[PDB]
Symmetry: D2
Subunit: 249 residues, 4 copies
């Protein structure tokens, strides 16, 4: 069978985009996948891959406790957690409202911390565990009018290193991916509703050495690698999956 | 006469350690300094340097608004903000309590964002403005059992870049210092608590290429430089003031 | 027939350590492997894996040209180059002799550049190409008395980004691995001949979050991943394979 | 006077950032020895009360001669600035091996060698400082500039290596990573383009400050890192890039 045959894999934000691609890639490799999402259409992603769906608002700490408990019971084991779910609140420090800023911090930074602790408790039971955080090139650099996302992804990058150090004694590896521009529905919607879609997309493509957008499946492959025993000496690493975005200007 | 003659400078956490050294260094260079702190001894630091003291819980958004308003009124202008105030909550993701984690994020990451926005509104009035964030080597690396501090200083590093980008059009430069081990009362307390204080201190010294602890005044000099017109082409920089700590293992 | 079935793979320094493990991992995945080395025992590594061996001093530009020409002819195609071969010259700037410093730069930095150009010309012919540079944690940080190695691995890291940008139009991805302490014969010899072998090894292990040395095979897996189409949106990346060495102090 | 009576060696001092560095040190009371291939360096030395040495930093004998003669002329060495650098246009595919090796020799081997030579002179008085002028292109790549990218990359990690190895000699070693600075070198490149104002605007737009740097702004960062105000700063790479490397 496959790389994750009979392993329990938790994927946050699995209803679409990179999270859906991650849930599919794990299920292709024989994993029992529990995905959560705020969007109820995540039910169909779980049905199609033979996994479990949990409708969960990751802003709420009680719902995060419930998700890991119920996922663990449904799968019978937890081997991998992927912290994929994330939101943004448009605006500079000047423009963003404090409640919106705090919600971005809660979902993007506090939830991955909390879920990593909850999942880590389930990961001691069988053999070794792995966590992969989906960061962004915007955890390592800033862009205009995106303070909450930049700050939270920055925190997630150093939280990845913190978890790597603190969970090594439990035989858990913790790594992150930093995607470049990935052609998820979220990004294609933003492009589509731009004044000049073709020009916007061309300009985004041109920021990458590969001169194209990434596919969600390409981020999934990097997550699968970092979650697998092929990455047995990799922990605390931030892997750019950005087509060379962060290698030049 | 001096580098900040007649400039208004806001310093958070000015009651002792690096914040006190920063407030003194600005006053030596002719600044009108408004420092805030929870600790009442901040009153004496202000009296000694000819500045204003505000007793302020930076956890509370109303108190942050009050501090910048009252500081601005007392000084007659705001030219510089230093986000120096910070806390830690001992523990891994496994051990730290969610409310303590959120308070570290509020003080260490949300407060600098909020104060930067409030201060930036006061800085348009005169000539150019500068913000300096006191981060840490633990914004760029993790250590054991310090998840909240690691995550919040990580966020502060990328928030520095975000503010740099968003405030550049307002002629406001935003930089950070990443100190190594600095001989503040906070660090001497930690050392004093160990079974063999001198051995603990020696072990900390040995992590630095300079084989000593930093002085608070040495961090103050880097902050003064980054706040000054000598750093007119420096924005979005994280300057290590760590005696070579982060240059090797 | 495997991940590299029928692909031509060039591996420098393949006679032992990480290079040998890389040559084996590619051959296990069905590659035609041409490895080169200064050591004639590399003949046996090639015989054992069904590959070709070329005895080559990579210091000499004529021998680098000969290696790629002869490898290309023997394999019938070039799909992957691994720049694994490297030397050190003990000493600070104060202690290292200029000719020894220049030889380290020639083997560790100039050779990978030159081989990448030669290999890239062969990689146009069939489908896409990949280059993986074996850097080190000492390309991103320094250690005492190792200036030539630190400088050359530093250069190799930015050369990896340069090649990523310049070879993207030829459909060639270029990435690096930055290994931590890997238990190759070279490292075990250094430990073995140390005043207190067990203490030396323990101290090296303790620098890693995983509290052990890496295996050459663990570096090989990361190289295979970066060389493969699973890493199709990964170029210009430096991937630590260091058991969390660079994530903390 | 921050460097009153200090001996300061500046490579590539004939123009651009090197000239601005030599002027800034002299303004702060330093005895400045600058070297350059360009003879106009003589005028920069005369104007600031310093010494000029015409020196091809590619040649190891000329590097030994420069530090010896500078040391004798100044009476002491307190600071070295490795500012001199060259580029060789081309990718790995396009650059010629000899041009690649010359860029490595001038940009990476010369700073190493000069740092060792200068360090030997710095033990004599109190503490010493070295500042390397790197680039944003030591931390990132751009198209068709492999030799410059590779050499500035090496210079960044050499800065850390020297920081560790020279800390015991009480020598601090730091680097600046400038963004686009309006030196004659950059204004020449701009001037050559079909639409110089558009080329300059495009360069400006890469910086959060939406302007080119002044050579004097790099000089101020070098003065700071060379000074006792930076007494706890060693092995640091300080971007002086108007926020260039903070975003894309
Ligand atoms: N697409 C890109 O270009 C790109 C670039 C870099 C990083 N990222 C990161 O990749 C991840 C996936 O993004 P995407 O492009 O697939 O976008 P997306 O908006 O489709 O996000 C994936 C899912 O997260 C879910 N989610 C959000 N908040 C949630 C909550 N409170 N509770 C439960 N689920 C919640 C959404 O419902 C959605 O299904 C995110 O971490 C994002 O920041 C994306
Ligand atoms: N000392 C070190 O070794 C070291 C290392 C690197 C980074 N740092 C950073 O440098 C800064 C100064 O640290 P320090 O060593 O002087 O320690 P410190 O504990 O003395 O902190 C500075 C001040 O912040 C104040 N403060 C904290 N929370 C506050 C709040 N809610 N409202 C108002 N005031 C508040 C404290 O009262 C204190 O006087 C911090 O940001 C710290 O994280 C310190
Ligand atoms: N082992 C570690 O702990 C470690 C740490 C990080 C980086 N690295 C890097 O990993 C790579 C593999 O090193 P290793 O530990 O296997 O050591 P190693 O010394 O066994 O090196 C591998 C091979 O390089 C060959 N080589 C050297 N110079 C050559 C030349 N001029 N021409 C041809 N072949 C030449 C040697 O003969 C040897 O077979 C190197 O780039 C090394 O710097 C190793
Ligand atoms: N101008 C920019 O935007 C920019 C960007 C990043 C960093 N830098 C770096 O700053 C430094 C100075 O750049 P600049 O713009 O002033 O350019 P520049 O070309 O004017 O160079 C400085 C001096 O170095 C001298 N020099 C070169 N090779 C020499 C040799 N072999 N021997 C002796 N002297 C030699 C030149 O004659 C010149 O006077 C370099 O290290 C450069 O790469 C500049």
């Amino acid at each position: 069978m496959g790389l994750f045959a009979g392993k329990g894999v938790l994927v946050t934000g699995g209803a679409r985009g990179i999270g859906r691609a991650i849930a599919q890639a794990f299920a292709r490799e024989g994993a029992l996948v529990a995905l959560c999402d705020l969007r109820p259409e995540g039910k169909e992603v779980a049905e199609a891959i033979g996994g479990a769906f949990f409708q969960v608002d990751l802003e709420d700490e009680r719902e995060r406790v419930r998700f890991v408990e119920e996922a663990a019971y449904a799968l019978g084991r937890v081997d991998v957690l992927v912290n994929n779910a994330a939101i943004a609140a448009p605006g500079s420090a000047l423009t963003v409202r404090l409640p919106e800023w705090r919600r971005v911090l809660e979902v993007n930074l506090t939830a991955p911390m909390h879920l990593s602790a909850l999942a880590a408790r389930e990961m001691r039971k069988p053999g070794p565990g792995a966590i992969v955080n989906v960061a962004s090139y915007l955890g390592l650099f800033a862009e205009q009018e995106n303070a909450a996302y930049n700050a939270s992804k920055g925190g997630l990058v150093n939280l990845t290193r913190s978890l790597a150090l603190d969970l090594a004694p439990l035989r858990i590896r913790v790594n992150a991916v930093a995607p470049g521009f990935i052609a998820t529905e979220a990004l294609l919607e933003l492009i589509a509703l731009s004044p000049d879609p073709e020009r916007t997309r061309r300009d985004m493509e041109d920021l990458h050495a590969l001169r194209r957008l990434g596919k969600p499946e390409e981020v999934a492959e990097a997550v699968l690698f970092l979650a697998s025993e092929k990455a047995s000496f990799i922990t605390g690493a931030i892997l750019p999956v950005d087509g060379g975005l962060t290698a030049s200007f």
